[PDB]
């Protein structure tokens, strides 16, 4: 419910009230698993194909007469049992993405955020004061905030200087309030969120 609000130097600037309905619920592991699986499946490019017996080059004619040669009967040199033949079934291009009810999506987002709020993996900063992109200064800020390797940085909107400062540090990822997703949140060990971003997240996830 009540959360400390820190400066970039670690000083405890103030306090914020975060809706228990967003950061305070008991995570639904079933729905969270379904959402992670769904997002991972949506990331798939199903560009995989093989040539079946119709698609293989040539192979129109009968290799030899049906009877009298003493050999097994055959119909085309591109049959699947032939070396160089067509493939039986095999991959064919298709999308792996599927949908889930919107209420389930929201429950998944709330479950991930509440798991972060539990286990003391959430921290709120007062603001980000990056006027120019400086990776070393952002790394210093993270070190002062005493954060683990994997951090998800959440801003209210697209903050270009914060994004440019952070995008080269391994394990650090930056998103906006609207960009929050289960894969990103669960992969991170800690969330560093601005006060305005946290307020917006509460406003939209209710």
């Amino acid at each position: 419910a009540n959360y400390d609000v820190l400066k970039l130097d670690g000083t405890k600037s103030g306090s914020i009230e975060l809706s228990d309905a967003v950061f305070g619920i008991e995570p639904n592991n079933s729905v969270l698993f379904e959402a992670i699986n769904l997002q991972r499946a949506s990331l798939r490019q199903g560009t995989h194909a093989v040539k079946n017996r119709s698609a293989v080059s040539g192979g129109g004619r009968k290799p030899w007469k049906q009877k009298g040669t003493g050999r097994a009967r055959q119909g085309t040199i591109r049959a699947p049992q032939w070396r160089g033949g067509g493939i039986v079934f095999g991959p064919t291009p298709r999308s792996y993405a599927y949908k889930m009810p919107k209420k389930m999506r929201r429950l998944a987002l709330r479950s991930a955020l509440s798991f972060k709020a539990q286990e003391n993996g959430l921290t709120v900063v007062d603001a980000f004061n990056f006027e120019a992109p400086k990776t070393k200064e952002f790394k210093n800020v993270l070190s002062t905030l005493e954060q683990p390797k994997k951090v998800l940085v959440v801003t209210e909107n697209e903050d270009v200087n914060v994004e440019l400062s952070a995008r080269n540090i391994p394990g650090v990822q930056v998103t906006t309030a609207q960009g929050l997703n289960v894969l990103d949140i669960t992969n991170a060990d800690s969330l560093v969120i601005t006060e305005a971003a946290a307020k917006k997240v509460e406003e939209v996830l209710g």
């Binding site: 995570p27 592991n29 079933s30 698993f33 992670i36 699986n37 798991f115 992969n187």
Partner: protein
């Protein structure tokens, strides 16, 4: 949870059966098809409803009736559904769709007499059953065909 500790919900997932992969599965060789006959073949089996040449049921039975091109079907509201609104409220098709009682309007809105009303309302609809009209009028309210 964690990406290295994912767990599907209990009973939510079952491994698919793979036939034709050895005797010990119990679906090797004939792959559950038994031995020979039309049903053992790839693409084999007669069309559904086929009875092997005996006259099919849907040929031995006669056709019946016709479809009315001008058929009207109404969205129906019962009195127990009308309970949702407070006393003195004027009920209209727009109000019903807004409050969500009626999802699709169809040829109109008909009030029906299942359930108990227990409220005084002015109900404006396209059709009323006799019992629905009587109950609306006898609970202190009024109805109008619009």
């Amino acid at each position: 949870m964690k990406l290295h500790e994912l767990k599907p919900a209990e009973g939510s997932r079952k491994e698919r059966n793979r036939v034709g992969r050895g005797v010990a599965t119990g679906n090797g060789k004939t792959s559950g098809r038994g031995h020979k006959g039309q049903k053992a073949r790839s693409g084999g089996g007669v069309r559904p409803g086929f009875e092997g040449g005996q006259l099919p049921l849907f040929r031995r039975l006669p056709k019946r009736g016709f479809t009315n091109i001008n058929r009207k079907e109404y969205a129906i509201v019962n009195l127990d559904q009308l309970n949702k609104f407070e006393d003195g409220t004027e009920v209209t098709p727009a109000l019903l769709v807004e409050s969500g009682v009626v999802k699709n309007e169809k040829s109109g809105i008909k009030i029906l007499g299942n359930g108990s009303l227990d409220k005084k309302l002015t109900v404006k609809a396209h059709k009323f059953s006799a019992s629905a009209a009587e109950a609306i009028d006898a609970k202190g309210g009024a109805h109008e065909v619009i």
